[PDB]
Amino acid sequence: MKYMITSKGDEKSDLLRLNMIAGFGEYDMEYDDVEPEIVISIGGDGTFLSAFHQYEERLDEIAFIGIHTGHLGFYADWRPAEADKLVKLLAKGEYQKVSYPLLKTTVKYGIGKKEATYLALNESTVKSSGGPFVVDVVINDIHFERFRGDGLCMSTPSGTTAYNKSLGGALMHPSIEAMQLTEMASINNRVYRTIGSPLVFPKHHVVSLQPVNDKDFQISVDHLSILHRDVQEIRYEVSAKKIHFARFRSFPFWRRVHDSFIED
Amino acid sequence: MKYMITSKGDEKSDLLRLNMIAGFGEYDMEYDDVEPEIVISIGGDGTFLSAFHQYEERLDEIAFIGIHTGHLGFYADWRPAEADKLVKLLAKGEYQKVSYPLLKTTVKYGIGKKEATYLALNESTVKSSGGPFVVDVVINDIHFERFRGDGLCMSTPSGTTAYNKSLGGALMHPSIEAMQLTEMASINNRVYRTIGSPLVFPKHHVVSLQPVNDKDFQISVDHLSILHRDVQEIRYEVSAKKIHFARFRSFPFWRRVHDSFIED
Amino acid sequence: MKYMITSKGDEKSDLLRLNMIAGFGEYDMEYDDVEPEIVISIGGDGTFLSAFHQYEERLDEIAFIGIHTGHLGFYADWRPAEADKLVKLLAKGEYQKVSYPLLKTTVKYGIGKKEATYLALNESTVKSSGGPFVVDVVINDIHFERFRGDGLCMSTPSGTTAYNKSLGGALMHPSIEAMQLTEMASINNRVYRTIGSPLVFPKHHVVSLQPVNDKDFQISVDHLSILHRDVQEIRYEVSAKKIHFARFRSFPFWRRVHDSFIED
Amino acid sequence: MKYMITSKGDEKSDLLRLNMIAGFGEYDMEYDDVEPEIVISIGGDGTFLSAFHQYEERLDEIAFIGIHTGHLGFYADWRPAEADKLVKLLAKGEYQKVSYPLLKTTVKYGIGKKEATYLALNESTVKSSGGPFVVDVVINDIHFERFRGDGLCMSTPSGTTAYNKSLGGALMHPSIEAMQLTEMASINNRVYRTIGSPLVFPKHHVVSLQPVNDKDFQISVDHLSILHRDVQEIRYEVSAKKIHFARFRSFPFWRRVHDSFIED
Numbered sequence A, B, C, D: 001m002k003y004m005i006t007s008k009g010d011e012k013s014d015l016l017r018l019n020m021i022a023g024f025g026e027y028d029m030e031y032d033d034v035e036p037e038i039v040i041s042i043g044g045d046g047t048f049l050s051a052f053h054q055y056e057e058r059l060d061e062i063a064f065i066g067i068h069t070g071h072l073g074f075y076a077d078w079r080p081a082e083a084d085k086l087v088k089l090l091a092k093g094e095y096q097k098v099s100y101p102l103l104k105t106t107v108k109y110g111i112g113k114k115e116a117t118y119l120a121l122n123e124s125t126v127k128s129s130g131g132p133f134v135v136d137v138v139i140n141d142i143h144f145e146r147f148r149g150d151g152l153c154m155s156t157p158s159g160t161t162a163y164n165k166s167l168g169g170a171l172m173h174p175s176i177e178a179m180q181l182t183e184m185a186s187i188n189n190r191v192y193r194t195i196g197s198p199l200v201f202p203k204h205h206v207v208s209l210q211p212v213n214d215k216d217f218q219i220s221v222d223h224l225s226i227l228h229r230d231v232q233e234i235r236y237e238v239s240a241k242k243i244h245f246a247r248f249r250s251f252p253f254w255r256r257v258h259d260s261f262i263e264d
């Protein structure tokens, strides 16, 4: 099987990568970072996020695996001391695949424009180019609210433990095909009104943000953050595409949440 | 078709009920409150909740409809001025059914006990008999947290706009088969830790609350509130059963939320 | 100096108490639990709260000191291993007094009634006798809001780290003469509106709760919880009375908060 | 008395300004925008904020008054229809002054640097230059927390109804000499910990933010927002300076809050 390994790039991660490559050299098992079937990430969630975005045009063909050199691995699965066991198990094909939902973001411009389309594993957020942030929120073509505040965050299920959590969003099991919209510092008074609460949308629901003033927005997709000018619409929906993980052993999502927030 | 009508019991609702009965007398269309196929509720959500609990052993056989004499009808569908049109449409069978998920609550006791089982359309909550409230939260047999605070609330999707909302929970579209757990005044310090965030569980996930001290709890199921003694376990899961609504015309959930919280 | 010692009542606290009494026997320093000038509490904050309420008619004459046998001493000052040093320092009168604000609660009834008056070190809360909870909130005689929800909590500055904190209230330095009002699960929709936010009131401001329906309320004052019937008014204001602590050494409030919530 | 009038600059505000000037021409009462004793602002709170910052070196000599051409006047006092009555009352000197606390912000740099000092009527906030935001929070020289998240907001009492409110802060009566610190999207997990809660500081307490990485910050002071490079420290304290308002008639702060958030 073709595989590749991304590293965080510190001494620890590089040496671990070299050892795994040497270990894989005893099997079959070819290193290929153009068309890999397995992508191993060694580092933290940031490294894992970069690996995902490196290969987003090949998601249907790849199973991802993370080794964490932290603290903190929501997309790890593995400790560095377990790397030899992982080489062994991965070479023997002793694994069942697990899929998580992804978020599609479409950014439509004026003139042309595009139509830029992005895929997120954690979330996409929108803020002003600074700038009061004011947008009309449209759900399946019905005007829902005029949002005023700092910005909005649209999260995948696996993303709910990240930025979503800090904003008061719910944690959602990744078997649920949904996206969740949270507010950043909404303004609520006698004249300005928002829902307040996070909103959880099923597949096929479309959430559209339309400028009120002010057509310039800072848009993030996971780690990536870009200033978009002359925006006519930002559009969110659950992607038809999914990320596939290689597992290996039981490590339930709720235990992962327990280990990350309660105690380990 | 067999039908019945529950009324809130004020002059407005009773007279509306009598007129609808008279209107149904011109069709076929028999009044039967033992084995109805259609249950019409005239009042508010409280009246609707009582109608549901009146007929919870016949949920597979009944389509529910609500007329609101409020303000505030999340389970209405209809205004009193539209009652004649509703009589007409309901008699002609001009409707498609919509189903919403329900919550199963199991309360297990010591000695015997039971095993009391309840069905909720909005939510089930647990508080102490007063009493510090302390429970172990167990998700699919793994210990997740020791919760200390005022209590816990487990909501259906349609329930998310009710008690769940007041506690900071997410609003969830009712096409999603899930339940949501929210905290009431959790204690968080260096020694006591809870997740903080609401938690959204898919079908087949089981959330179990187990007493730490203190085996006496005040348990609510929608409007019903009962003191249970000598509790060994409280168990939550998405019910296999569903409530069926008769519709009639498009009134999307998100528009219902808009009309109820933003403006109408 | 006259002193007394309350104990939590477990083996640890009782023996510590006996040793301190023996230690005080070597000074002057008379044990008197009728008219003490120093009240030592050995246990947790619960023990300390009971000691305070034991002597609330003598607050102007007493300096309080807490030794914690926890984890968790917001009203401790002292570890059990330091008890000998404390005996020594307290006998020599090597201490400056620190005062914290208190909360006055007045409960007015119908017929008669009373006028029951309570003093709180942490907070007073109000909930329904169960029961939807609905009250009119009146600030300095102006109608501010109709509150619907689970209840309300009025906290002292030192109380802000307790129930207040769990409800989303601000932590306030105890040098500020104020009280803070927080909501429990407020209902907010198109027809029902509350402020949402915690409210911080200075000295001489009066907050009055007046029944809308329903004149029966469960009222807590620190650990004490009582069902009051036929209530006409519940009235809150910063007390003219203060609790005095004996200190001893610098242990700033913010460090106390750090040690209790961040790390120790 | 010397006075000046700032206008929002739309037709409505300019004409109102011209009429008030004409009205003041019948008294004594000289227009002077260099050394005014009365500053009238016609517009919204933004206009009022600009008027304040226009004259921040003369705060001890000026009484401010606002007329609102909104909706929304927390620093208005007056409707446009009342402008004639205001001209009359202001000319006769029929007013008592009211003072509100202000926030001092000190920004210290490396090399030199400065020491930039700012005065805020609403708040000062800090965010990264984008950028993960990580700062050490130091209260009166004791390390309190390492904050990770979007940013921090330090509010005056009158500022608590603004940005502070959106971030979950308490509303504080402006007779209380304090500042309030709120979090923007704090990260809390097993390894990263913040207090969560808003913090209310008395006069003479000093809150210092010290960079961990990353010495570049976007700092706001009311409407003003500036990118500061090579920051060594950001320092907050309640200013010795106060804003003085001219009043005129009773319009209590809590009624102002009611009118702005509940109903008018």
Ligand SMILES: Nc1ncnc2c1ncn2[C@@H]1O[C@H](CSSC[C@H]2O[C@@H](n3cnc4c(N)ncnc43)[C@H](O)[C@@H]2O)[C@@H](O)[C@H]1O
Pocket: A044, A045, A046, A072, A073, A074, A122, A123, A158, A159, A160, A161, A162, A163, A164, A166, A222, A223, D148, D149, D150, D184, D185, D186, D187
């Ligand atoms: N999925 C997930 N769950 C929990 N924690 C995560 C996750 N993904 C990344 N992280 C953690 O984010 C940290 C930096 S990853 S860089 C990009 C991510 O940063 C996250 N981010 C950005 N601002 C915030 C704030 N303010 N709060 C929480 N998370 C934030 C956002 O989700 C982005 O996708 C690091 O501690 C990771 O362990």
Ligand SMILES: Nc1ncnc2c1ncn2[C@@H]1O[C@H](CSSC[C@H]2O[C@@H](n3cnc4c(N)ncnc43)[C@H](O)[C@@H]2O)[C@@H](O)[C@H]1O
Pocket: B044, B045, B046, B072, B073, B074, B122, B123, B158, B159, B160, B161, B162, B163, B164, B166, B222, B223, C148, C149, C150, C184, C185, C186, C187
């Ligand atoms: N599904 C739904 N959404 C929104 N609002 C609802 C819903 N069901 C009922 N209600 C409203 O609850 C009010 C009384 S119904 S009696 C039983 C329900 O009360 C609700 N309850 C109890 N305490 C609270 C609090 N504290 N906050 C919000 N809701 C609460 C809970 O969901 C129970 O199921 C009335 O205004 C109804 O319009």
Ligand SMILES: Nc1ncnc2c1ncn2[C@@H]1O[C@H](CSSC[C@H]2O[C@@H](n3cnc4c(N)ncnc43)[C@H](O)[C@@H]2O)[C@@H](O)[C@H]1O
Pocket: B148, B149, B150, B184, B185, B186, B187, C044, C045, C046, C072, C073, C074, C122, C123, C158, C159, C160, C161, C162, C163, C164, C166, C222, C223
């Ligand atoms: N002042 C203060 N700060 C922090 N923690 C405190 C304080 N006073 C007591 N406690 C802690 O409350 C716990 C039980 S004391 S019994 C009475 C107090 O319970 C508190 N209480 C009741 N329900 C709650 C909830 N739901 N959350 C937080 N605190 C609560 C309330 O403040 C009462 O005054 C124990 O861990 C103490 O260390």
Ligand SMILES: Nc1ncnc2c1ncn2[C@@H]1O[C@H](CSSC[C@H]2O[C@@H](n3cnc4c(N)ncnc43)[C@H](O)[C@@H]2O)[C@@H](O)[C@H]1O
Pocket: A148, A149, A150, A184, A185, A186, A187, D044, D045, D046, D072, D073, D074, D122, D123, D158, D159, D160, D161, D162, D163, D164, D166, D222, D223
């Ligand atoms: N003091 C006060 N209370 C309530 N509302 C206020 C106040 N001052 C200004 N405003 C309102 O802020 C709006 C724009 S003023 S421009 C500068 C202020 O914007 C405020 N701001 C910036 N971002 C936010 C967010 N996200 N939420 C609330 N307020 C925000 C912040 O307090 C700044 O001082 C307008 O509706 C004013 O009526």
